[PDB]
Design a protein around this nucleic acid. Structure first.
Ligand SMILES: Cc1cn([C@H]2C[C@H](O)[C@@H](COP(=O)(O)OP(=O)(O)OP(=O)(O)O)O2)c(=O)[nH]c1=O
Ligand SMILES: [Mg+2]
Ligand SMILES: [Mg+2]
Length: 342
DNA sequence: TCTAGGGTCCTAGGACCC
DNA sequence: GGGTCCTAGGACCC
């Protein structure tokens, strides 16, 4: 009863799009990210920049210290959305069982597909070739019987390559697979697991489920499952967005309420425009604000509210400012909405 | 080096309901 | 006491 799941993942997505649209960037180190003066981080980097150690989520000041000639780009999100829509239309040529996880990646369930003699290996190759033929961008892919193995597999032969895990190969693959490779196991969880002597799925296989359930809750069940190749999550295709948020980090911290309110005045019409694209009457379930301080602690306060309203967001930010700020600088202000449950 | 902005999901205490 | 909604925080992902 094995499913065939493909995970398709665009190579250096934002940067690949910028290089196609400006071939002068093809061989120099480039990254999409905010300037050091805007206190930015790297969204992504091309392979010439990665060679220096430049990575996603790296602070831009660190990226430039590693790669002084890094060319920093602002990002063209409509260009990326356009490429995303196109590759999702290419996925639809092969199956309707498509769960996009972000602009540049998706799960495909091709169990019931009849496109390349039921070969998921060849469907993945054909999708990657079509994407290259029609978008001049490359993609990598992973093929496995379950979601998480497919997603791990798509990383192992990038860029512009794929990797297939058959059911026969799953036990040997798992034995030495680091836990940190499992989606959902991040730095904090991996360090906790490491401090129990648990580094790989093989380690977790020698663990008692009751033990993991005590020390991790529902996460310990997931750890126990994945360590055996168990991942029953179905490819959905029905997921909908639940929130809309708009936030900005200032180049310098602000110390005065007048400055905070001015920022909100600039953020609010952007939040309204994005909400209106999906709910034109602006009806919502909750709205709220976010402050982040110069020491990097952050607070959110949100509440039931029927319709996007600027003055209530200002009032709420003023309460949060007055109450939970303690003379610190503020580096970030954000606005937030929770969408109604349709 | 000095730490984004777009999000999802889980936890957990108290309110509230029965 | 058992279920369920509000809310803040935080790990995590892209
Ligand atoms: C991981 C990450 C990605 N992104 C954006 C930029 C990425 O190009 C896009 C998709 O992310 P990824 O697929 O994680 O990264 P990538 O495509 O650039 O690199 P890879 O070739 O390894 O797949 O999302 C961020 O803005 N911040 C992040 O921390
Ligand atoms: Mg990618
Ligand atoms: Mg991706």
């Amino acid at each position: 009863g094995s499913r065939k799941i493909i995970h398709v993942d665009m190579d250096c997505f934002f940067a690949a799009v910028e290089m196609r649209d400006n071939p002068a960037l093809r061989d120099i180190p480039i990254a999409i990210g905010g300037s050091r003066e805007r206190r930015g981080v790297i969204s992504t980097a091309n392979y010439p920049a990665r060679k220096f150690g430049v990575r996603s989520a790296m602070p831009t000041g660190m990226a430039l210290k590693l790669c002084p000639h890094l060319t920093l780009l602002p990002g063209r999100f409509d260009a990326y959305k356009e490429a995303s829509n196109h590759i999702r239309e290419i996925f639809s040529r092969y199956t309707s069982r498509i769960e996009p996880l972000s602009l540049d990646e998706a799960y495909l369930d091709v169990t019931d597909s009849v496109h390349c003699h039921g070969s998921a290996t060849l469907i993945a190759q054909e999708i990657r070739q079509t994407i290259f033929n029609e978008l001049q961008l490359t993609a990598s892919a992973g093929v496995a019987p379950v979601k998480f193995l497919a997603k791990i597999a798509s990383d192992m032969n990038k860029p512009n390559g794929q990797f297939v895990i058959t059911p026969a190969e799953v036990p040997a693959f798992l034995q030495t697979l680091p836990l940190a490779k499992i989606p959902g196991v991040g730095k904090v969880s991996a360090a906790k697991l490491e401090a129990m002597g648990l580094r790989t799925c093989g380690d977790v296989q020698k663990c008692d489920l009751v033990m993991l359930l005590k020390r991790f809750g529902k996460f310990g069940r997931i750890l126990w499952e994945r360590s055996q190749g168990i991942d029953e999550r179905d490819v959905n295709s029905e997921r909908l967005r639940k929130s809309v948020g708009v936030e900005r980090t200032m180049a310098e911290d602000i110390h005065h309420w007048s400055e905070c309110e001015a920022i909100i005045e600039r953020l609010y019409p952007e939040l309204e425009r994005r909400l209106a694209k999906v709910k034109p009457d602006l009806l919502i379930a909750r709205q709220g604000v976010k402050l982040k301080f110069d020491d990097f602690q952050q607070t959110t306060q949100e509440h039931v509210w029927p319709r996007l309203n600027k003055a209530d967001l200002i009032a709420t930010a003023r309460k949060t400012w007055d109450e939970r700020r303690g003379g610190r600088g503020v580096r970030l202000v954000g606005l937030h909405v929770t969408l109604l449950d349709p």
